[PDB]
Amino acid sequence: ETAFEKTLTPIIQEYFEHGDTNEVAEMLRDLNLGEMKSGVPVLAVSLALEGKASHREMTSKLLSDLCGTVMSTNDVEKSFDKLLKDLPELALDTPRAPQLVGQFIARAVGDGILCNTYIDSYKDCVQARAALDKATVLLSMVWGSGGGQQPVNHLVKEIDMLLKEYLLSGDISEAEHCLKELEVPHFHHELVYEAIVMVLESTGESAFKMILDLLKSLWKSSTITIDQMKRGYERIYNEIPDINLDVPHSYSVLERFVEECFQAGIISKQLRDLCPSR
């Protein structure tokens, strides 16, 4: 039994890293799990509960792409009954384990891997009700995602709106929290590159200001590692003879900007140093 977890735990976990709905599904088949099948979504969710959002997402999809291949409608029925059993026990190691489990159920029902009026026919303990009210409201109305093994130019879409939205919200934390949520901390030059472009492409003074502020406060929240910040400017110091095709002026601007940056200390006298001109 406890010989169970000692076994699945390390494929569920391995999976959060190859991301293969499949490979998982094979290896379980060959373990020929019994009734104790319904103990696999429990293990999976409850692990992802201590993972990132990624893993949370990844799991919900594993719960789908596993149900009808190697798992009965009726495992998932109970697997969820156990998750509400253990909610008081789970919240010890994940405080928001209630609302979270809730979002799992919302989606569960949604991928149709779960019964329709399930919640309804589940009618002692705030923790489960709490977690059923989540699922309820969610439905009557992602986890969003998701980073890492996402498609590259998908990430770009996100970074784009991140920036686009910021320019109308004027909300810096708001930006940070989405850059942060994407989970691709080695891709942040994209954020920087995209952002410099907006300044390069804009007219009038707001773009420039608003992006120099965001880029300072990002550098300052150690959110943009000094390395990132540099692959950023290099991408720009690079494309500028091409960008100059869509924006004449782009030169005497991007350098006016590198100047603001240097002056604000976000970049070395030697990046500022390395800027092009003609």
């Binding site: 109305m141 095709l245 869509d246 004449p248």
Partner: protein, 371 residues
């Protein structure tokens, strides 16, 4: 502004003898009757005259030259036939979205330029080969004629869009240089929001007896809309006030504006929690609905132009537009000629100053929420 010398009006897109495919496209796209400019400019273009249209920034206006470049394209000939210039990558891009949209049931081939991560790939496309319609900035385009990725040989329609803009972005030289590479034969359409000397003198040196359409039209002034501010000291007490309002006006249609996607989802689901069913916006099909079934809604602000707020009696600014210009885009709309209703501002202590600015920006008065 320019002196109009042509205004013959065409009521329906049906009387323009457009391809049927083109027709089907322009209805699927959502158009019904042709707009101000469409009733006046499409025909002249289609008929081949140089046209100089002084009109407000496109909807609409874009659809105009788009409909005529498409009506004129020789589907059969695989070589780039109409060349359109915009002031930004962004803006060239939307032009090509509209073209492809209307161009949907015809084999029309259209391409905007960039930009530049895979320019290598962009270029190998362009020749060869060979989009029928290419849109891009004057700089990009010209650099392309120079390199010969693009042939002027078959280009028979040359449209300059937002010329005032293009010139002032620094493109005068590149515009001329392109001119002198296109056939003395090429039709020229120049639309521009405004007609400064610069623009004029382009018109003056490149167009034959052109026809001058001037269906622009201004003000534009929120005198059909009662504007209020209800004072909520802290943002904490915003959600609270909202639902209080919801039952003391019990409105059945209202659009509530929010500054970020995240805060929409927040509010949306904090209100479903309270029994007030409400919609949030995001992709076209799942989106198309909310806009298809709209055509209580909480949207960002950005997609606000993805839905017509003018047939909505109540607009509520939960957040306040950081961009002043952008306020009117949310709330107002002038008075008949339609039209509208009222809109309500939730201002914080902090927001105190920020609203008094909106108030002098549009020389307008915003009174406090009554009873």
């Amino acid at each position: 502004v320019i002196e109009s010398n042509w205004n013959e009006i065409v009521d329906s897109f049906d009387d323009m003898n457009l391809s049927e495919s083109l027709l089907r496209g322009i209805y699927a796209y959502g158009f019904e009757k042709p707009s101000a400019i469409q009733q006046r400019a499409i025909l002249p273009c289609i008929k081949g005259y140089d046209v100089i249209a002084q009109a407000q920034s496109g909807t609409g206006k874009t659809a105009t030259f788009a409909i005529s470049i498409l009506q004129q394209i020789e589907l059969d000939l695989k070589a780039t036939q109409a060349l359109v210039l915009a002031p930004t990558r962004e803006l060239a891009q939307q032009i090509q979205k509209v073209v492809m949209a209307l161009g949907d049931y015809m084999g029309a081939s259209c391409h905007a330029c960039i930009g530049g991560t895979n320019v290598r790939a962009e270029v190998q496309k362009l020749q060869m080969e060979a989009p029928h319609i290419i849109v891009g900035t004057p700089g990009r385009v010209f650099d392309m004629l120079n390199r010969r990725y693009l042939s002027p040989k078959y280009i028979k329609m040359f449209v300059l869009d937002e010329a005032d803009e293009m010139l002032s972005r620094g493109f005068k030289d590149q515009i001329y240089d392109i001119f002198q590479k296109l056939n003395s034969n090429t039709q020229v359409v120049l639309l521009s929001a405004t007609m400064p000397s610069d623009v004029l003198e382009v018109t003056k040196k490149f167009m034959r007896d052109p026809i001058r359409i001037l269906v622009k039209k201004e003000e534009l002034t929120l005198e059909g809309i009662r504007q209020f501010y209800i004072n909520v000291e802290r943002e904490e007490w915003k959600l609270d006030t909202l639902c209080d309002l919801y039952e003391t006006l019990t409105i059945t249609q209202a659009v509530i504006f929010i500054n970020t996607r995240r805060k929409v989802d927040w509010l949306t689901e904090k209100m479903h929690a309270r029994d007030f069913t409400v919609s949030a916006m995001d992709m076209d099909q799942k989106e198309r609905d909310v806009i298809m079934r709209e055509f209580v809604l909480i949207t960002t602000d950005l997609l606000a132009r993805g839905i017509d707020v003018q047939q909505v009696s109540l607009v509520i600014n939960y957040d306040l537009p950081t961009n002043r210009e952008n306020y009117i885009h949310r709330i107002g709309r002038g008075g008949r000629f339609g039209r509208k209703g009222v809109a309500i501002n939730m201002v914080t202590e902090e927001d105190k100053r920020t609203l008094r600015d909106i108030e002098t920006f549009y020389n307008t008065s915003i009174e406090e929420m009554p009873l």
